């Protein structure tokens, strides 16, 4: 009809098929995919932005997997940051072994 | 040849897209360069928060009953556990209500 | 339009059932004039930063992305309402 | 503790389900009076996450005409 | 014989019963749409709004007058009272930041 | 008059549905209901020996609230309410 | 035509709630009462029982009841199943102690 | 058959039947004695520990360990698995009374 | 000076080989990977509630050595009784 | 290195003569113990957060610029000591 469009960017699949592998016979709406949606955003925002911080007051320019574990750290509280640095290094060890 | 190309989630074993992770810490202005390993280390701890939150959203939903997942669960939720409260201090979820948690002064004798 | 019908417009049951939802069983009589005013300068403030983002957009209309934006450089991150 | 559920419970007087909404509230009471049963009372909605509705239904049903 | 009429707080507890198990909206969205109409007519001329951005500003507003109502709640149960007084939203706002 | 078959069956269906909803359960298989009769009939045969028990050492011929709740104390259960 | 049938899962779920939100009982008084009496007929002849001690008797059924379907549904759900089994009680009474 | 090729969960068999005829203990007592100290380190310093309390301190944890994973395997026959997992071992203490 | 005391290699000091011996000692065929962290995190912790009530009983006993009667005391008071070392 | 002669550091005068420079006349007893708690507190967050800056910086002494950064990253921008 017109001349195109352009199209946005979203993690519903990503979301949906994390909600089907922890939880069998299970479903989400529309409301609850974009309040998760949005924190998803944001919390990458605020990781991106604590790990340029830390890479700009460390005299460096690469920001790499222990600049976003530090950001992590200081963003995570204690036993959840940990499970996050844990599932991060047991990624990081699954990448280096496969590609 | 090319042979075959794996995707990334497939050789990291996780539901995030690495792809797009990387294409956002590049044209995002963050840095000049992007490690490897970073990209991976993002997707893992947002899919595991994602899982943490899913479950807990169970949680209030079958708490409240009902057949989705919807803003007043996720406010339960969040207001339930300590370390999402914590977390997200200056998030206000919309559609939702509060919780009744009060002191024990204002009573009908 | 251009009326003081306005303050007036956040009706005194209105702001008596926010502050039952809150937590508040009786209300005084001065509460209401004090929160229209609070609410006010909130909406005021939100609406100039809203302003101000959509001159520097080069637009003319407000839009809820935007309202997000002045909410979250003000310091109350909102969601479902856009992404 | 007691006055607590019961505000959040709301009622006139200290009912044994005050009591034990106030009793599983409190970690340390329930460590106590772990082998503690309150009469006239029932329990909290304590719920995991499985036994939920939302079977998005999935196919699963066969001839509907 | 006995008060037939319904004691007071009671009724008002009810109500904070009904609206704290419920998920619907209290403000209108009309007279707030023209208030933040109002609003903007002192800053630009021919300005127009969308209903999903009137509908989170109604919301934002809404969890925020919550949020000070439970404060100034909290400050009149703890000066032992029952009521709110606009000396404890003054001393709410002042200790949360938003006046001085 | 009465019929001791007619006991097991006094714990009907719908009673052990609704405990089991007020438990926690949603579907309740078929066989649930004979295994619940028989493990309460199990206890209550137990508590009723104990309360037996207590009250022909007591020198009495009435079981009351006070000898159920040290039955129950003593097997590993404290009741309250109904006593002191 | 349709007189209106009835299903389970949601139903059920409702029906949870209304009785985890209420105190009342579910096990009738009268028919424990034929029970427990029958039961201390093959100990003592001649006995009588309290409507006190019968009625902690049924509250203490009750609440061993509740928690052993809440362990019963536990296992169910560890077990990736959504129903209770009778070898899921076997086990749950296996594993509680109660199989001797 | 070939000396240079097991096959894997027979020699488990094996090594299960001849570890459950001995009654010796598994865990050894240097490491052992050093975590007794390490954690009594921090309730009350200058403590000396017996010869004969560190014994039956071993022996208790190796029997509830047995005991728990006793519990661990009973339970994870149950899922029609045939191996333990960790979701398991909080259930079984969870159903046992322990965790709560 | 010449000081050397104990660190945190003491969780690690209940090996792999010895838990997966004990488990086959109990009853299990195969062992899981983290199945060695949450028995070593079990058996602290209830190490650490033994050792804790032993303390209390050496100070209520006014000495500074715990006992294998005070460990029984604790065994039996926790509901765990033993035999064989004490009486 | 006593675990217990750090908390009481903070001597009652010394909490008496913060309280006096605030706007507090009177104090009470049980202020001193709280005012130490919160303190305690504080400091913990602050230390922890200036060790893992230390650790990511490849460092074993924290620095001022270090302290700065992790009291602005909490939300307190102080002047004066670095830049």
Do not use: W
């Amino acid at each position: 009809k017109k001349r195109k469009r352009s199209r946005k960017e979203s993690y519903s699949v990503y979301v949906y098929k994390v909600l089907k592998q922890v939880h069998p016979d299970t479903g989400i709406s529309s409301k609850a995919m974009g309040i998760m949606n949005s924190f998803v955003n944001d919390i990458f925002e605020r990781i991106a932005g604590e790990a340029s911080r830390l890479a700009h007051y460390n005299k460096r320019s690469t920001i790499t997997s222990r600049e976003i574990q530090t950001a992590v750290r200081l963003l995570l509280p204690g036993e959840l940051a940990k499970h996050a640095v844990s599932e991060g290094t047991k990624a990081v060890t699954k990448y280096t072994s496969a590609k | 040849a090319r042979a075959k190309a794996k995707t990334r989630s497939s050789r990291a074993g996780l539901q995030f897209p690495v792809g797009r992770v990387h294409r956002l810490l590049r044209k995002g202005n963050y840095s000049e360069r992007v490690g490897a390993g970073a990209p991976v280390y993002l997707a893992a701890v947002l899919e595991y928060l994602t899982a943490e939150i899913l479950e807990l959203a169970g949680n209030a939903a079958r708490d409240n009953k009902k057949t989705r997942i919807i803003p007043r669960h996720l406010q339960l939720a969040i207001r339930n556990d300590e370390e999402l409260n914590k977390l997200l201090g200056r998030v206000t979820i919309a559609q939702g209500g509060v919780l009744p948690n009060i002191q024990a002064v204002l009573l009908p004798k | 339009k251009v009326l003081r019908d306005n303050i007036q417009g956040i009706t005194k049951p209105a702001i008596r059932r926010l502050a039952r939802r809150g937590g508040v069983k009786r209300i005084s009589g001065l509460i209401y004039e004090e929160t229209r005013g609070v609410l006010k300068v909130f909406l005021e403030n939100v609406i100039r930063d809203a302003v101000t983002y959509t001159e520097h957009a080069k637009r003319k209309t407000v839009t809820a992305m935007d309202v997000v934006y002045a909410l979250k450089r003000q310091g109350r991150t909102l969601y479902g309402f856009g992404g | 503790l007691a006055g607590n559920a019961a505000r959040d419970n709301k009622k006139t007087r200290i009912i044994p389900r005050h009591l034990q909404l106030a009793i599983r509230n409190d970690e340390e009471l329930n460590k106590l009076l772990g082998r503690v049963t309150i009469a006239q009372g029932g329990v909290l909605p304590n719920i995991q996450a499985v036994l939920l509705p939302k079977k998005t239904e999935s196919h699963h049903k066969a001839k509907g005409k | 014989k006995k008060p037939h009429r319904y004691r007071p707080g009671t009724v008002a507890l009810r109500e904070i019963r009904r609206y704290q198990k419920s998920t619907e909206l209290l403000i209108r969205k009309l007279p707030f749409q023209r208030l933040v109409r109002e609003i903007a007519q002192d800053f630009k001329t021919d300005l127009r709004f969308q209903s999903s951005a009137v509908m989170a500003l109604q919301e934002a507003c809404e969890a925020y007058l919550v949020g000070l109502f439970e404060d100034t709640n909290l400050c009149a149960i703890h000066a032992k009272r029952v009521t709110i007084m606009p000396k404890d939203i003054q001393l709410a706002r002042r200790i949360r930041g938003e006046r001085a």
